[PDB]
């Protein structure tokens, strides 16, 4: 096949101008989409706060209007999903991944409204859910929609505009362009065969997405954490140990989301009214915990600079980790619309901080800042649970600009994915696709 | 396919422990190797410096001892490549690329000593070439060497260990662990068919490689440029224009490297003595340039911060850019062992800084710093000529740490890789692998 390859080599990277232009408009719309979705989630959480002040005297009334305001919004999003778009429950990444294997449909006429307005429901109630799931599936479908509109043919185009959509989608959720592109290249593309996902075109989509985000967001970065200390060579072995800790917990967490998916399906069996009611209970519990124990609820982007700085006690870190594991499972395993990615950064940090804390007290000769161990462990549930270590390392890198920590971030990351592999664990997004293709068959 | 897929998903990212443990040995070896390559080169540039001290009075004599010292060292490397391993000429990234498509041999028992010691000659005489060619080829060969020694069977084991070695080698040359992983993913894996390269094992080898770099180098990074200003959004269109300029020049420079590869071959006809004699005059010229005007010679990493801080006049920059476009084509089209990746970084930094200075005077309302256009231009030739923009960006990112410039950098990058596609350029590493398979069926 020598002569064949000489031909292909000379034809490499010649994406059709049609796809390059269209990836631009996908990026842009996904950008405006995520920006709108981001503004809307905020506005709801705010109206929720100003309610607790029209009533801030009667504390039992206070705990009540906190619960019902989230419950109602939870339910509204659960309902929007079962009634009109069931594959828009949960993250949506496993679907958009299925769409790339050509095994799941991109029902964009249903999912765009269902995910967007249904996500605003669950996120806006203050449930423990990220915006990544929403934006990524929303972005994916937006790619499909502009395909079907301009009726472009080829595999290249269907897969590209699907990729650049969900890529631009993740980018716009975190202001993380590099992280989006890598997410397609490492995690989303079809993993057992070749593909015609133009990477140059995913690049154009991500650009536009990210520019649109800079137009409605500037002067504030999602997280500021400032410059932390370096790490000496003789400290690296501590980050490897922290990777191993993630590597055994990573898979353990994966078992729980699945068994909790099962456990919560026993609660409604499929019944849209038991389900929506159950979601409202979950919602209201989060909005209640949102008032009374805020670090145990919400997406988690907030307490990440607090937890780097070392402002929490060790007892608090232990509390938050247990409590947030529990609400993370309740919210994500329930099937409410919304990703798990962003709350796994939170669980990661908290754990890394707690470790840096013990590490600082054991080794004063090392001159540690517990904040470095938190940054290494932020991308570490991503490594050990969804097994996209290159994505999380660069995602964290983009969010925290502490490049002098690249070696320990990497080292904790592979430690995580190595022990996650070796203790018998599977990628989370992949093992959700499969259970969903194995119900898309066991019914026959 | 649904039954097939479901079964494959439940089995994903289960790289055999044998491969992973062997990836760790590959990275360790390449880091040590690459460190050693780096220390050697400097030691020889040092000797050439202190030898100009013992002859620092006779200005004609001085010019001659610099010419000869490098001329001699040049020839030693041209010889070591023609006599014992021809596929160790030039970069060797095309070579490792062919090897991953199963279309070229990894003659490691021949190439390791040739590329290592031949590289020491051309680099150490201060020729316009980068340790990256040498280190990526050495790394891949080191990855084949442990595959053989330990008799690991399989297409996966052969493709992975060959890859993590070449990533380990780019990392070690630039202290760029991500930029190494991304090189394999974006440019060096088989580009048109699926492959069983294990990313988790490339990562492991790059860690070990880079850890070696930090044990013998730390508290010093290759380039330090400071923290530059941010990029207002009403400034970004200026960065699309730069990538367009880089996007048209990229292919023209690609022609010139392909074309002059041809023209220097007519000089020696293929003959090892005219060739080694030609290389000594190139490498002799370089070590001479390196005294009467050091910015027209060398790998070029030197003048990237000197350019970014606008410490050059507009004239000097125009010079340095044309002079270095010359001495880059002479050194690399000549067959001399050594990468083009670093001398391209220095070309784009020079181009960008010049562009920055024009902007600063046309638009005082934008409060510009020319240094931010250097950092977007640094990796723009990489984007426009070898057409690995992701790897390029993330490389310069890991080398300059001005992450606030990620958007202008990403934009000049696509600005180049788009206009390079639309003016009919090619991935120069794939264009060389092509012209080398075209002679292998004729």
């Amino acid at each position, epitope marked *: 096949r020598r002569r064949q390859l000489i031909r292909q080599l000379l034809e490499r990277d010649k994406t059709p101008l049609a796809i390059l232009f269209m990836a631009a408009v996908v990026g842009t719309l996904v950008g405006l989409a995520a920006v709108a979705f981001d503004k809307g989630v905020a506005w709801l959480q705010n109206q929720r706060m100003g309610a607790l002040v029209h009533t801030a005297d009667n504390y039992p009334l206070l705990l009540t209007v906190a619960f019902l305001c989230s419950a109602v919004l939870a339910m509204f999003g659960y309902f929007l999903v079962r009634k009109y778009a069931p594959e828009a429950g949960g993250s949506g990444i496993p679907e958009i991944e299925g769409a790339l294997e050509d095994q799941r449909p991109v029902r964009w006429w249903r999912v765009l409204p269902v995910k967007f307005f249904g996500g605003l429901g669950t996120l806006g109630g203050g449930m423990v859910l990220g915006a990544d799931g929403p934006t990524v599936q929303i972005g994916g479908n937006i790619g499909r929609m502009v395909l079907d509109i301009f009726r472009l043919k080829g595999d290249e185009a269907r897969h590209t505009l699907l990729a650049t959509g969900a890529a631009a989608g993740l980018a716009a959720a975190f202001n993380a362009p590099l992280a989006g592109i890598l997410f397609i290249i490492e995690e989303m593309r079809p993993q057992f065969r070749y593909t015609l996902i133009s990477i140059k075109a995913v690049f154009i989509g991500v650009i536009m997405s990210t520019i649109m985000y800079r137009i409605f967001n500037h002067e504030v970065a999602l997280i500021d954490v400032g410059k932390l200390s370096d790490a000496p060579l003789n400290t690296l072995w501590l980050y490897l140990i922290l990777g191993i800790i993630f590597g055994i917990f990573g898979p353990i967490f994966n078992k729980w989301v699945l068994g909790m998916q099962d456990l919560l399906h026993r609660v409604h069996g499929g019944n849209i009214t038991k389900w929506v009611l159950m979601g409202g209970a979950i919602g209201g519990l989060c909005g209640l915990l949102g008032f009374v124990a805020p670090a145990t609820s919400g997406g988690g982007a907030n307490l990440i600079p607090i937890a780097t700085a070392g402002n929490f006690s060790m007892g608090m870190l232990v509390f938050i980790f247990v409590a947030r594991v529990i609400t993370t499972l309740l919210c994500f395993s329930s099937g409410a619309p919304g990703g798990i990615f962003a709350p796994m950064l939170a669980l990661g940090t908290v754990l890394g901080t707690a470790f840096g804390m013990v590490a600082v007290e054991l080794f004063p000769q090392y001159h540690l800042e517990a904040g470095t161990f938190a940054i290494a462990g932020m991308g570490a549930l991503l490594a050990a649970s969804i097994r996209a270590p290159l994505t999380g390392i660069i995602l964290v890198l983009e969010m925290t600009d502490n490049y002098q920590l690249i070696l320990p971030m990497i080292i904790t990351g592979l430690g995580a994915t190595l022990l996650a592999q070796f203790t018998g664990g599977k990628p989370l997004y992949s093992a959700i696709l499969a259970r969903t293709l194995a119900k898309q068959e066991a019914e026959q | 396919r649904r039954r097939q897929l479901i079964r494959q998903l439940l089995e994903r990212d289960k790289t055999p422990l044998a491969i992973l443990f062997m990836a760790a040995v590959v990275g360790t070896l390449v880091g040590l190797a690459a460190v050693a390559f780096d220390k050697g080169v400097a030691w020889l540039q040092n000797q050439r410096m202190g030898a100009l001290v013992h002859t620092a009075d006779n200005y004609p004599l001085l010019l001659t001892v610099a010419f000869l010292c490098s001329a001699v060292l040049a020839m030693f490397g041209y010889f070591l490549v023609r006599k014992y391993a021809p596929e160790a000429g030039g970069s060797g990234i095309p070579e490792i690329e062919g090897a991953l498509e199963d279309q070229r041999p990894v003659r490691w028992w021949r190439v390791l000593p040739v590329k290592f010691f031949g590289g020491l000659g051309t680099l150490g005489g201060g020729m316009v070439l980068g340790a990256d060619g040498p280190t990526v080829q050495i790394g891949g060969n080191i990855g084949r060497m442990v595959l053989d020694i330990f008799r690991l069977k399989g297409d996966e084991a052969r493709h992975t260990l060959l890859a993590t070695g070449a990533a380990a080698g780019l990392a070690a040359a630039f202290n760029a662990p991500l930029a190494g992983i991304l090189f394999i993913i974006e440019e060096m894996r088989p580009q048109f068919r699926y492959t069983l390269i294990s990313i988790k094992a490339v990562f492991i080898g790059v860690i070990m490689s880079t850890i070696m770099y930090r044990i013998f180098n730390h508290e010093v990074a290759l380039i330090d440029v400071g923290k530059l200003s941010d990029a207002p*959004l009403n400034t970004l269109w200026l960065y699309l224009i730069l990538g367009i300029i880089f996007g048209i020049f990229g292919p023209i420079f690609n022609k010139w490297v392909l074309g002059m590869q041809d023209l220097l071959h007519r000089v020696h006809g293929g003959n090892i003595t005219k060739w080694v004699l030609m290389g000594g005059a190139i490498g002799g010229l370089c070590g001479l340039l390196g005294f009467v005007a050091p910015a027209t010679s060398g790998g070029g990493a030197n003048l990237i911060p000197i350019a970014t801080a606008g410490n050059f006049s507009m004239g000097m920059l125009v010079f340095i850019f044309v002079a270095r476009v010359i001495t880059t084509l002479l050194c690399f089209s000549s067959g001399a062992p050594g990468g083009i990746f670093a001398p391209m970084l220095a070309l784009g930094t020079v181009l960008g800084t010049a562009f920055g200075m024009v902007a600063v005077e046309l638009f005082p309302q934008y409060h510009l710093e020319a240094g931010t256009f250097a950092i977007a231009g640094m990796g723009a030739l990489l984007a426009a000529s070898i057409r690995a923009p992701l790897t390029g960006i993330i490389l310069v990112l890991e080398m300059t740490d001005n992450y606030q410039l990620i958007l202008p950098m990403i934009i000049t990058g696509l600005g180049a890789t788009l206009l390079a596609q639309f003016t009919g350029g090619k991935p120069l590493y794939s264009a060389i692998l092509a012209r080398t398979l075209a002679k292998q069926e004729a």
Partner: antibody
Amino acid sequence: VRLLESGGGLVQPGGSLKLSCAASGFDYSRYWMSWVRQAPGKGLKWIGEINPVSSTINYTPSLKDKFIISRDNAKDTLYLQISKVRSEDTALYYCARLYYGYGYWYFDVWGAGTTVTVSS
Amino acid sequence: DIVLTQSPAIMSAAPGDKVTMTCSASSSVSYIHWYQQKSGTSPKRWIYDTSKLTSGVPVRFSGSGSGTSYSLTINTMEAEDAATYYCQQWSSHPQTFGGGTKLEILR
């Protein structure tokens, strides 16, 4: 985050004076600073700017060395020297930290002012 | 230099009036800024990029315009809004300031 300018007061026509501006509250480097003046009862007029590394220094259309702006990042202080002073330099001088949103620049944070009187 | 010129040099208003002052430019400017200078204070960045409010500026304020006509508007002016307001461009160099619209209160 404060800006405290000083050094104003009396000068004879034709003479000169050096205003200082004491910055505090922010990384004063990596920040353009600028001088704006306000003749008594009149409106605002830009004097000039200086980028953080003292590489760039722009001025309103003045004469030769009418104004000499300068920063001592080491002491977090902005400087302005006015010379060949005439009765139009009697004004209130404001130190200001420059910044931007979309990229069209503005006078982010102003000081209180120091006052210059050109009188014999 | 772009010469900016502001609508009334002086204007009076009763709290509860909608108030509108206007910045007009000799050439095209874009994304202009507004500063409020209460008596005996330094100018305070009020509105930037035509219509963006500095943090702490109350919502009763708004900006708009384009090309050569820009305005600042107080929707139901309040008594504490009495100040001289200055517009400023830096879309061309050198940047330049308007002349002032002094807001006076009727009570």
